[PDB]
Amino acid sequence: HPTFNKITPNLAEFAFSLYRQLAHQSNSTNIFFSPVSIAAAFAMLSLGAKGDTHDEILEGLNFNLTEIPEAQIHEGFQELLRTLNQPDSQLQLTTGNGLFLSEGLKLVDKFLEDVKKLYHSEAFTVNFGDTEEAKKQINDYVEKGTQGKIVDLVKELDRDTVFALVNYIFFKGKWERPFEVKDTEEEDFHVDQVTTVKVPMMKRLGMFNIQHCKKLSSWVLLMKYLGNATAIFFLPDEGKLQHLENELTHDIITKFLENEDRRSASLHLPKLSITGTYDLKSVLGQLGITKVFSNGADLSGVTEEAPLKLSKAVHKAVLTIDEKGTEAAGAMFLEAIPMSIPPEVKFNKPFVFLMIEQNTKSPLFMGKVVNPTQK
C-alpha cells in the first residue's frame, strides 16, 4: 500500500507553489512555512465539505481527481499520520488538526467519523458570543498542545466564527553523528548590503554530501538527523533567488536526497529557531480555494443548518534544530572540524533548505533564511 506515493509528488510540487507566493509578495519576510499544515488541513477537508467544494480543497492541493481517485487518497496521509505520527523515536513532533467549532451546530457525526478516524481531527464545542474564551481555548490549544511554540498566533477574533482551524507543532531534530556546541561562536552571516550581519553561527568538519551543481548553481548541503528524516540545506551563488527558487523540481532533489557519499570541507552555520506563522485565508484565494471561506456554500455539507463558511486556518511552523547530538567528536574531530578540504560551507549568505522524510520523501518545512532579526 504505497499510499504516500499518490500524494508525495503531488504535494511536494505544491511546496514550490506557496514558497514563491511569499517569495513573490516579499523581499522582507523570513520563510518558515510547513508544506504540511497547508496541503493537509485543506485536503483533510475532502470530508467536511463535498461536491464543488473539495474541487477547490483537494483540487487545489495538487492532486488531480481524474488522475488520482479522492476516496483512494485519504490514507496517503494516515501514513503521514501513522508513519510520520506513530509515537516517534527521535523526530517526535506535535502538529495537530486541532479544529475549532461553535457550541451551536449539529455537524455530521459521520463526517466526524471520517476526519477523526483517519486524520484524528480533534473536535469540540465553544460559544463565539463572547470572543475571548475561544482564545482561552485556541492559542490556548497552541500552548495546551504545541508544548508552547505557537504561544500566540491568535490576537483577534470575531463574534461569529464557527468552523475555524488549528495545526499546532512542536518539532524535533538533532544529529545522530552530531555537532559541537563548543565550536559555536557568533560570526558574520550577511544578508543585504543594508543587512550585513553578525549572526550566532556554529562550526565542524564532517565529510559532508556537499555539491555545487550547475543545475541550481549553489551549495547543496545534506545533514543526517536522529530519526529517519534527511535535512537538506542549499546556499545561493551571487544574486540568486530564481534558477533554483524558479527552476527547482522534485527531481532536482530526488537525486540529492537519493545518494550517501563523502567529502571533508568546513561547515559554517548561523542558528536555527526561525519561527513563522502563516494564515491560509490570505493567500489561498489568489491561489484558488476561493468560495471555501466564502460568504456561503456547502460547508453545511458538514452540518446542513446555519449555512457554514470557513473561519480561517494557520501555521506557525516552529523550528527545532541546530547542532545537538551524541556521537560527538571527542578529540579526533575537534580539529578535524575546522578541517576544510580546500573550500568552506561558510553559511555567510542567505540560503534556503527543507526537511525530507526517510519513510517517504516528505518536505516538513521549506524556507529561505532571510535574516535572523526575524526568527
Question: What CATH number corresponds to the domain at position 44?
Answer: 3.30.497.10
**Can you give the residue range of the structural domain that contains 251?**
176-270+325-375
Count structural domains, the chain. Answer: 2
Q: Is 60 exposed, middle or buried (0-12, 13-18, 19+ CB in 10 A)?
A: buried
Dihedral angle computed from the Cα positions of residues 104, 54, 37 and 288, in that order, rounded to the nearest 10 degrees: -110
- CB of 31 within 8 A of CB of 23? yes
CA pair distance 335, 352, nearest whole angstrom: 28
- CB of 234 within 8 A of CB of 352? yes
Does residue 264 share a domain with residue 284?
Answer: no
Give the HSE-up count for residue 83: Cα atoms under 13 Å, Cβ half-sphere: 19
Start-to-end C-alpha separation, the chain: 39
CA pair distance 211, 12, nearest whole angstrom: 22
- CB of 204 within 8 A of CB of 179? yes
- Grid cell digits, residue 47: 470530508
CA pair distance 181, 6, nearest whole angstrom: 41
Does residue 283 share a domain with residue 360?
Answer: no
- Residue identified by cell 523540481 is 249
Does residue 278 share a domain with residue 190?
Answer: no
290: phi then psi, degrees, rounded to nearest 5: -45, -100
- CB of 98 within 8 A of CB of 140? no
CATH classification at residue 230: 2.30.39.10
Does residue 314 share a domain with residue 218?
Answer: no
DSSP class per residue in 90-135:
S-----EE--B--SS----TTTHHHHHHHS---------SSTTTTT
CA distances in angstroms from 224 to 90, 179, 353, 357, listed in the order given = 12, 11, 14, 11
Count other C-beta atoms under 10 Å from residue 146's C-beta: 24
**Those residues with Cβ within 8 angstroms of residue 331's Cβ, 6 or more apart along the chain or in another chain:** none
CA 198 to chain centre: 27
- Residue identified by cell 504540511 is 36
> What is the 8-class DSSP label of residue 187?
B
The C-alpha R_g of the chain, in whole angstroms, comes to 22
CA pair distance 348, 367, nearest whole angstrom: 16
- Residue identified by cell 555545487 is 212
- Grid cell digits, residue 249: 523540481
Closest CA to 345 of 249, 229, 212, 238: 212
> What is the 8-class DSSP label of residue 279?
B
100: phi then psi, degrees, rounded to nearest 5: -150, 105
307: phi then psi, degrees, rounded to nearest 5: -20, 75
CA dihedral over 69, 72, 77, 79, signed as positive or negative? negative
115: phi then psi, degrees, rounded to nearest 5: -70, -30
- CB of 329 within 8 A of CB of 175? no
Dihedral angle computed from the Cα positions of residues 283, 142, 108 and 102, in that order, rounded to the nearest 10 degrees: -90
Closest CA to 6 of 75, 85, 55: 75
Does residue 127 share a domain with residue 68?
Answer: yes
CA pair distance 375, 357, nearest whole angstrom: 24
Does residue 118 share a domain with residue 47?
Answer: yes
Closest CA to 312 of 168, 169, 106, 161: 161
CA pair distance 102, 124, nearest whole angstrom: 8
Closest CA to 114 of 99, 130, 136: 99
Proportion of the chain in helix, strand, coil states, percent, rounded to 5 = 10, 10, 85
355: phi then psi, degrees, rounded to nearest 5: -135, 120
Does residue 316 share a domain with residue 224?
Answer: no
Does residue 199 share a domain with residue 75?
Answer: no
DSSP H helical ranges for 184-227: none
Q: Experimental method used, please?
A: X-ray
Does residue 183 share a domain with residue 157?
Answer: no
CA pair distance 42, 160, nearest whole angstrom: 21
CA pair distance 33, 15, nearest whole angstrom: 9
Does residue 119 share a domain with residue 25?
Answer: yes
Dihedral angle computed from the Cα positions of residues 196, 198, 204 and 207, in that order, rounded to the nearest 10 degrees: -10
Closest CA to 16 of 374, 368, 360: 368
CA pair distance 68, 3, nearest whole angstrom: 11
156-190 b/e (C-beta count within 10 Å ≥ 16 → b): ebeeebbbbbbbbbbbbbbbeebbbeebbeebebe
- Grid cell digits, residue 241: 533567488
Count other C-beta atoms under 10 Å from residue 129's C-beta: 11
CA dihedral over 51, 52, 58, 63, signed as positive or negative? positive
CA pair distance 282, 253, nearest whole angstrom: 29
Adjacent-strand bridge partners of 167: 97
